[PDB]
């Protein structure tokens, strides 16, 4: 068994992650594997969410 992660989001999305040298040595790398995975995956979600200024416009006028 390896390290694993499992993700849930309020918009119906569910995500599962899963990727000489020593056992724990290997474990450490698999974790950068996962850390990466997760960091890609979440930025990608943040990006899609992006893709406000007007809202920041209506306030001003309100006050003018």
């Amino acid at each position: 068994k390896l390290p694993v992660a499992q993700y849930s989001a309020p918009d119906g999305v569910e995500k599962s992650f899963a990727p000489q040298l020593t056992y724990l040595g290997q474990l450490r790398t698999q974790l950068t594997g996962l850390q990466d995975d997760i960091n890609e995956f979440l930025t990608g979600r943040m990006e899609l969410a992006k893709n406000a200024d007007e809202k920041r416009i209506q306030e001003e006028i309100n006050q003018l």
Binding site: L2, P3, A5, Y7, S8, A9, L24, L34, I38
Partner: protein, 83 residues
Amino acid sequence: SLDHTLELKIPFETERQATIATKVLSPDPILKPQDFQVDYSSEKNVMLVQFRSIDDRVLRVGVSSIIDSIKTIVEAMDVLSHH
């Protein structure tokens, strides 16, 4: 609500290792408790870390930093385990 959720299950060689890692972990996040929460623990040899967050950006920042601590420990148990 803290509904962006991620659990990370990490396997060590044995329960002791797992147990000690959770003691050593002692997190302390830069993130507001209202926006971000983490729960660690261990069952047998697996370490359970459970994150809860406002949204994906908070989550991302908090999870990476933790993973970093964890690695540090895995690195340290590596050198000790072998002498």
